[PDB]
Design a protein around this ligand. Structure first.
Ligand SMILES: [Zn+2]
Ligand SMILES: [Zn+2]
Ligand SMILES: [Zn+2]
Ligand SMILES: [Zn+2]
Ligand SMILES: [Zn+2]
Ligand SMILES: [Zn+2]
Lengths: 190, 190
C-alpha cells in the first residue's frame, strides 16, 4: 500500500503508485518528456507536449503543411541520392498529424520505403483517430489503414516492426511519375 | 506476295503477314498454346485455353477451389521453412481466377510474399475485370487493387517488377493468427 516511485512527478505527474507497477507506468506516463518527432537522431531536443509545435516551427526547417482531413502529399525526387526523409504536417480536427516517408538502405541489396502517421498528442488522443494512406496509379492502388501512433511512443518502433505502409524502390517507380510520388492521406475520427 | 507465316498459324490463324511489324502479333496471338499457369517452372504441360482447368484438376490437387466473387483465402503455415506457394481458384462471373501467393527471398535473409491474381482466359477478357486483395487485422488493413493478368502473360514479370501485393514475414506477423493468414479476394467487372 506504499505509493512512491514515478520519476515524473516534477513535470506535474500528480500520481503515486506502488513499486510493482513502476517500470510499466513510466514508459507510458503522460508526463514523460517528449522527444523531437522528426525522423533522425540529429535533433536531441526534448520538452513538453505544448512545446513540440513551437520547436518544429522555430528550430527546424520549413516543413510543408496542408489543411484538411483528406489531402495528397507529393514526395519529390524519391529517387534522388541523399534523399531519405519526407515530412509533412497535416492539420485537421483541431490537431496536427505528422506524415513521415522514410527511405532506408538495407544491406541485403534493396531500398525500402516506410510511410506512417503520428499525432502531435497523447496516446489516448491518438486512439480516437484512424488514418489511410493511398498510392494511386493507372488501374492500381496500394492502401494502408491503421491507428496513428502518438509522438510519445515514436515512429521508430512501428517502423521497426513494419507496422505502417511498406513498399520499395521498384513499387515506388510503379506509382511515381516524373520522379515524384503522390501519397493520399486521409484522417478520420472514430 | 511473299507473306511470312505465323508459327501458330497451324492452330487457327490464316492471318499470314510479313515479319517487320506483324511478327509481333504472335506474342498477342489468340491461338498460341497456353502453358501451365501454376507457379514455378516444374510443370511442362501445354495446351488450349479449354484444357487449362481440367489440367489443374488432374495434375494439381493442391489447389483450393472456391465459389463467389468475394472470398477469403486462408494460407496456412506461412512461417514454415518449407512453404513457398499457395494457390486457390476462384470461380465467379462465368470465369476462373487463379490466386497465387508466393514466398521467396530475392534478397538474402529477407523473406517476401507476392500475391497476385490471374484470369484463366485471354488478356482482353482480363481487361474487363479488376481484383482486390485484403489483409484484415485488428485496427489495420493492407489492400491492393489492380487489373488481373492473363495466364498467357504469366506471373514472373509482375513479381519481378512488384506489380502485385508485396509484404514480408514481419508484416505477415501483424495479420496472421495461429500461423495462418487470411487474404480477402474480391473480383469485380469493370
Ligand atoms: Zn508517471
Ligand atoms: Zn527537433
Ligand atoms: Zn499517369
Ligand atoms: Zn497467329
Ligand atoms: Zn501443370
Ligand atoms: Zn531486406
Amino acid at each position: 500500500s506504499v505509493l512512491f516511485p514515478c520519476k515524473y512527478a516534477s513535470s506535474g505527474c500528480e500520481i503515486t503508485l506502488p513499486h510493482t507497477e513502476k517500470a510499466e507506468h513510466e514508459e507510458l506516463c503522460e508526463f514523460r518528456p517528449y522527444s523531437c518527432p522528426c525522423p533522425g537522431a540529429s535533433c536531441k531536443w526534448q520538452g513538453s507536449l505544448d512545446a513540440v509545435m513551437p520547436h518544429l516551427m522555430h528550430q527546424h526547417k520549413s516543413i510543408t503543411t496542408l489543411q484538411g482531413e483528406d489531402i495528397v502529399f507529393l514526395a519529390t525526387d524519391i529517387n534522388l541520392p541523399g534523399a531519405v526523409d519526407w515530412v509533412m504536417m497535416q492539420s485537421c480536427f483541431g490537431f496536427h498529424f505528422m506524415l513521415v516517408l522514410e527511405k532506408q538502405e538495407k544491406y541485403d541489396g534493396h531500398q525500402q520505403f516506410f510511410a506512417i502517421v503520428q499525432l502531435i498528442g497523447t496516446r489516448k488522443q491518438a486512439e480516437n483517430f484512424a488514418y489511410r494512406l493511398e498510392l494511386n496509379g493507372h488501374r492500381r492502388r496500394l492502401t494502408w489503414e491503421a491507428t496513428p501512433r502518438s509522438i510519445h511512443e515514436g515512429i521508430a518502433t512501428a517502423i521497426m516492426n513494419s507496422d505502417c505502409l511498406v513498399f520499395d524502390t521498384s513499387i515506388a517507380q510503379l506509382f511515381a511519375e516524373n520522379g515524384n510520388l503522390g501519397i493520399n492521406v486521409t484522417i478520420s475520427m472514430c
